[PDB]
């Protein structure tokens, strides 16, 4: 009685565009073109698709299928599958927090740019500002100029000394205090996600209509814009030039696997939650297939969108676009690309729609990111929760604000890297691995094929079967081992991170993982009988 069954989506297209919205983000824009043009160029398409087909798609569709079939949260679904792995649902909840600490600060940067783009003359064009040094050298200025090791561009100066104010910190050691502007920006962000998540899937499914469609429009405008630019063929050349020898490197495949995984992000419970609020009769196979093909093709065209403008930028300078594309990260979009669109007619337009496009990319992904955790806790603590949703949503959101307060600092950018590389990545792969292994081996892939057979009416192919049994956990296992084996020395803005950073990172990497073996210990410690009896009843799901 009472509430009972959960709510459903208002329309198919709403959740289709919703999962597409989650799938597509910043990384799709700048990450893939960089890792692509760096690793054998266009040839990078060959393993990337493979790592998709054999790796990404099966995890994606498995996650989605479990989601639509069981209609449970990230924590409650393990109660009815493998109780011992219930801690998985908790782990993600911590992970997301770590993700939500830096992810929205980037959008806060893009927002500071967005509000700083309303002026007729854009700030990062001139050097006559309050933050520029004597090194600031800009164009429409005396020619014959010769760049110096210490010299700095007005865009690099703007991004460095103003929106980041990273010069006010010596590193991870001393990074305080806080830039209140980015605090107001990220506050506005937490507000615009607050009013887009608090009611649930009904509102999110409608905000996504804008947040998931506009980026393609902006990419089209910057696409036709970058295409009409002189000497733009250099960036495309450097972008799709086949270097098959690079395919001999055992690394590239890893980059491709990691890329497709972390741009599809399966087994994170968000797709699970988005699938939870859907029709049982409704198909999800076609959904997953197409949806993925979107995050991917979208990445492919995004490559052109970036490297056309990078090509023109390499044309106004002196070629080897790689040089203008050395640094990968926020500097590629916030400095190089911004300085690039600055030297174009009606630059205010392309700037506004550009940074607006960035925010628009981060927004939906963030929506879904929180949405998964919220759904998980609500389904895990029903009645105990739902008195109001805006209460718990407010709690987790302001919690994310306090979590981002460490990131809103001067050296905050540093932390952004430290959290993006060290903390999140290995663990999610880990929890995705444990999840896949638990669904394919513990729950039995046979009964899973029976569930799909009851879902769509037919048992899933032997391809998906062998992918779930072997190929996908090997896919995650590959990236896990390759990651652990070679933790990365990481650097940002002429500043090498301290040797101990990784230690710190590992802390942030393990502080989320500690919950599942201790939950296994809690279960096996609480469950009476013998190890085989309690572990046999702990391997066997809920009877009711």
């Amino acid at each position, epitope marked *: 009685g009472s509430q009972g069954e959960r709510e459903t989506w208002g329309k198919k297209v709403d959740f289709l565009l919703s999962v597409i919205g989650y799938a597509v983000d910043l990384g799709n824009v700048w990450r893939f073109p960089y890792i692509c043009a760096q690793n054998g160029g266009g040839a990078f398409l060959l393993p990337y698709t493979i790592m998709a087909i054999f790796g990404g798609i099966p995890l994606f569709y498995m996650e989605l299928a479990l989601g639509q079939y069981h209609r449970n949260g990230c924590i409650s679904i393990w109660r009815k599958i493998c109780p011992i792995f219930k801690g998985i649902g908790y782990a993600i909840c911590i992970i997301a927090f770590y993700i939500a600490s830096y992810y929205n600060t980037i959008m806060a940067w893009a927002l500071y740019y967005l509000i700083s783009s309303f002026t007729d003359q854009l700030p990062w064009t001139s050097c006559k500002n309050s933050w520029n040094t004597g090194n600031c050298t800009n164009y429409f200025s005396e020619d*014959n100029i*010769t*760049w*110096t*090791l*210490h*010299s700095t561009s007005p865009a690099e100066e703007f991004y460095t000394r103003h929106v980041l104010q990273i010069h006010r910190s010596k590193g991870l050691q001393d990074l305080g205090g806080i830039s209140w502007q980015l605090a107001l920006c990220i506050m506005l962000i937490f507000t615009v996600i607050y009013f887009s998540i608090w009611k649930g899937v009904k509102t999110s499914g409608k905000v996504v209509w804008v947040t998931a469609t506009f980026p393609y429009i902006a990419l089209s405008v910057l696409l036709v814009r970058g295409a009409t630019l002189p*000497g733009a063929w*250099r960036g495309v050349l450097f972008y799709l030039k086949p270097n098959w020898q690079k395919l001999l490197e055992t690394g590239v495949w890893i980059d491709a696997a990691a890329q497709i995984f972390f741009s599809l992000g399966p087994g994170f419970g968000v797709l699970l939650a988005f699938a939870s609020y859907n029709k049982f009769n409704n198909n999800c196979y076609q959904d997953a297939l197409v949806t993925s093909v979107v995050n991917c093709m979208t990445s492919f065209v995004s490559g052109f969108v970036i490297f056309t403008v990078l090509g023109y930028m390499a*044309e106004m*300078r*002196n*070629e*080897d676009v790689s*040089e203008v594309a050395k640094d990968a990260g926020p500097s590629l979009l916030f400095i190089t690309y911004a300085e690039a669109i600055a030297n174009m007619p009606a630059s205010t337009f392309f700037a506004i729609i550009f940074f607006l496009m960035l925010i628009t990319l981060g927004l939906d992904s963030s929506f879904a990111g929180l949405e998964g955790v919220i759904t998980a806790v609500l389904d895990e603590f029903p009645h105990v929760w739902a008195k109001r949703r805006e209460r718990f949503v407010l709690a987790v959101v302001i919690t994310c604000f306090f979590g981002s307060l460490v990131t809103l600092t001067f050296g905050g950018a540093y932390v952004v890297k430290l959290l993006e590389e060290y903390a999140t990545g290995p663990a999610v792969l880990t929890v995705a691995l444990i999840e896949a292994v638990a669904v394919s081996w513990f729950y039995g892939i046979t009964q899973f094929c029976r569930d799909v057979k009851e879902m769509l009416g037919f048992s899933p192919g032997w391809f998906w079967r062998i992918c779930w049994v072997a190929i996908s956990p090997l896919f995650l296992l590959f990236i896990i081992a390759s990651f652990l084996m070679s933790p990365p020395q990481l650097r940002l803005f*002429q500043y090498n991170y301290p040797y101990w950073s990784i230690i710190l990172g590992y802390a942030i990497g393990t502080s989320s993982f500690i919950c599942i073996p201790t939950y296994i210990a809690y279960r096996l410690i609480i469950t009476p009988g013998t190890f085989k009896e309690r572990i046999i009843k702990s391997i066997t799901p809920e009877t009711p």
Partner: antibody
Amino acid sequence: EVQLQQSGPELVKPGASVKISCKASGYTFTDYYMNWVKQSHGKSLEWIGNINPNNGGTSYNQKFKGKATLTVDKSSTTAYMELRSLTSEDSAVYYCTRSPVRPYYFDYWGQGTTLTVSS
Amino acid sequence: DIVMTQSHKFMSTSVGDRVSITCKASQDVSTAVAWYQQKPGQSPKLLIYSASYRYTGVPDRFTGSGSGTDFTFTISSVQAEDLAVYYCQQHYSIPRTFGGGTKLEIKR
């Protein structure tokens, strides 16, 4: 004005090592990349690699990777190049030349260093 | 990598005549070519940078042209002291490579 005074000629036996200095003067030493160019007898110029005086930012050539080692000293504003596993091909004239970051031309060169690898 | 090719190893000219040295690159270079003048027994001296621009201390009789792959170094009034070996060099892609070198022999 701007002068790059290198070290004198060196006669060294094969299999050994050899180090060449480069006292830079007449400009801000930390404001420019320091490069090294190899020139064989009757052959063309050959770029070995550069170095950033600030942090010792060495950028070598794939043809010279593990063949040459560039170092730098700010306390005396002097760049060094060390060569190991010396052969008859290394018997060439070497220059240390200043260069900006962009555009990457070699404005000022050293007087040169004659290296002879023979027993 | 990039191959800077000077097809003519030797070029004959006279004092006062108009001489022009060619330079062929592997791919498109836009306008990123520098011309150097190395007199016998001296270090290479920078004359031209960025295809057409002259460096400071370089006489007006030295000019540069070309945009793309083929580039040209021009001297209108050849002097007796202009006897040297001229090199062309690209400055965009790592590593920086040089031309084979065109020795300018004077005819009298």
